[PDB]
C-alpha cells in the first residue's frame, strides 16, 4: 500500500545522511490528509520539504529522530500494491 | 477516491534495487513538477558525476552529467539498460 519515504541531507554540505520508510498504511491516505498534501498528482510523484510543523505529525512513524536544525528532510508518498 | 491515485503514476525503485548503474545515493531533490509540489526523486553515482532522476509518467530513470547537466538518456532501474539515447535539447543545469 502506501509508505512515506523519508530522506535527509546534511545542511552544511548537502551530503546524503539517511533514508527510512514508514510502515505500510494500506489504502489509508489520511496521513497525507493531515499534512495538507492533496492526493492529486502527488502520490508516486516527488519529494516534499519537511517543514517544522510537519515534524510532530511524522515522528511517530520513524526510528530516526528528525532534527531539522541539523539536516534538510524530504518526504515522498510512494504507493505499490500489497506487501512491498 | 485514493489508491486510484496510487495507480496514477509509476512507483519509484528503492535505492538498494537500482541495478547495474554503480553504487547510488539519494541527492537533494531539486527538479520541480508543474502539477504538484513534488521535487523529483534524485540519486547520484560515479562519485557524484552522474545524476539519475525518477520519471514517474514514463517509469524510467532520466540520467544526467553533473558537471553541465547534460541529458544522458533514460535507463531501466531493474537492469540498468539504456532505453532512450541522449536528447541534446534537454538538461538540468538550472536544478543542480
Ligand atoms: Ca543540534
Ligand atoms: Ca530533483
Ligand atoms: Ca522521459
Ligand atoms: Cl520497517
Curated annotation (Swiss-Prot), chain A:
The protein's name in its UniProt record: Colicin E3 immunity protein
MF GO annotations: toxic substance binding
UniProt cross-references to InterPro entries, sorted A to Z: Cloacn_immnty_fam, Cloacn_immnty_sf
Segments passing through the bilayer: none
UniProt record, GO biological process: bacteriocin immunity
Gene3D superfamilies listed in its UniProt record: Cloacin immunity protein
Subunit structure: Native colicin E3 is a 1:1 complex of A chain and protein B (Im3). Binds between the translocation and cytotoxic RNase domains of intact ColE3, blocking access to the 16S rRNA substrate. Forms a very tight 1:1 complex with the cytotoxic fragment (residues 456-551) of ColE3 (ceaC).
Keywords from the named record: Bacteriocin immunity, Plasmid
UniProtKB/Swiss-Prot annotation, chain B:
Expression induction: Probably induced by SOS-stress.
Mutagenesis or variant effect for residue 62 to A/Q: Complete loss of cytotoxic activity
Consequence of substituting residue 62 to A: Complete loss of rRNase activity
Location relative to the cell: Secreted
Residue(s) at site: Stabilizes positive charge on His-513: 55
Location of the region described as Cytotoxic RNase (C) domain in the Swiss-Prot/TrEMBL record: 2-96
Location of region: Disordered: 62-96
Record region (Binding of immunity protein): 75-96
Effect upon mutating residue 90 to A: 1000-10,000-fold diminished cytotoxic activity
Domain free text: Has 3 domains, the translocation (T) domain, receptor-binding (R) domain and the cytotoxic RNase (C) domain. The R domain forms a 100 Angstroms-long antiparallel helical hairpin with the T and C domains forming globular domains at each end; the Im3 immunity protein binds between the T and C domains and probably blocks access to the 16S rRNA substrate. The hairpin motif interacts with BtuB, but BtuB does not translocate the toxin. The disordered N-terminus of the T domain (residues 1-83) binds to and occludes OmpF trimers when added from the trans- but not cis-side.
Quaternary assembly: Native colicin E3 is a 1:1 complex of A chain and protein B (cognate immunity protein, Im3); protein A is 1,000-fold more active in inactivating ribosomes than the native complex. The cytotoxic fragment (residues 456-551, C95) forms a 1:1 complex with Im3. The receptor-binding (R) domain binds obliquely to its receptor BtuB without displacing BtuB's central plug; binding unfolds the R domain. The N-terminal 83 residues (T83) bind OmpF; trimeric complexes with colicin E3, BtuB and OmpF can be cross-linked and immunoprecipitated.
Family to which the UniProt record says this protein belongs: Belongs to the cloacin colicin family.
The name this protein goes by in its record: Colicin E3
Native source species: Escherichia coli
Gene expressing this chain: ceaC
Span of the entire protein shown here: 456 to 551 of 551
Amino acid at each position: 500500500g502506501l509508505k512515506l519515504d523519508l530522506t535527509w541531507f546534511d545542511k552544511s554540505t548537502e551530503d546524503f545522511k539517511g533514508e527510512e520508510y514508514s510502515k505500510d498504511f494500506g489504502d489509508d491516505g489520511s496521513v497525507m490528509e493531515s499534512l495538507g498534501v492533496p492526493f492529486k498528482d502527488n502520490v508516486n510523484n516527488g519529494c516534499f520539504d519537511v517543514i517544522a510543523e510537519w515534524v510532530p505529525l511524522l515522528q511517530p512513524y520513524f526510528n530516526h529522530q528528525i532534527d531539522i536544525s541539523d539536516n534538510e528532510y524530504f518526504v515522498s508518498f510512494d504507493y505499490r500494491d500489497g506487501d512491498w | 477516491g485514493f489508491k486510484d491515485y496510487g495507480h496514477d503514476y509509476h512507483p519509484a525503485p528503492k535505492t538498494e534495487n537500482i541495478k547495474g548503474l554503480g553504487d547510488l545515493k539519494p541527492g537533494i531533490p531539486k527538479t520541480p513538477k508543474q502539477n504538484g509540489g513534488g521535487k523529483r526523486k534524485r540519486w547520484t553515482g560515479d562519485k557524484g558525476r552522474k545524476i539519475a532522476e525518477w520519471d514517474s509518467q514514463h517509469g524510467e530513470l532520466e540520467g544526467y552529467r553533473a558537471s553541465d547537466g547534460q541529458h544522458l538518456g533514460s535507463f531501466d532501474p531493474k537492469t540498468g539498460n539504456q532505453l532512450k539515447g541522449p536528447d541534446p535539447k534537454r538538461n538540468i543545469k538550472k536544478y543542480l
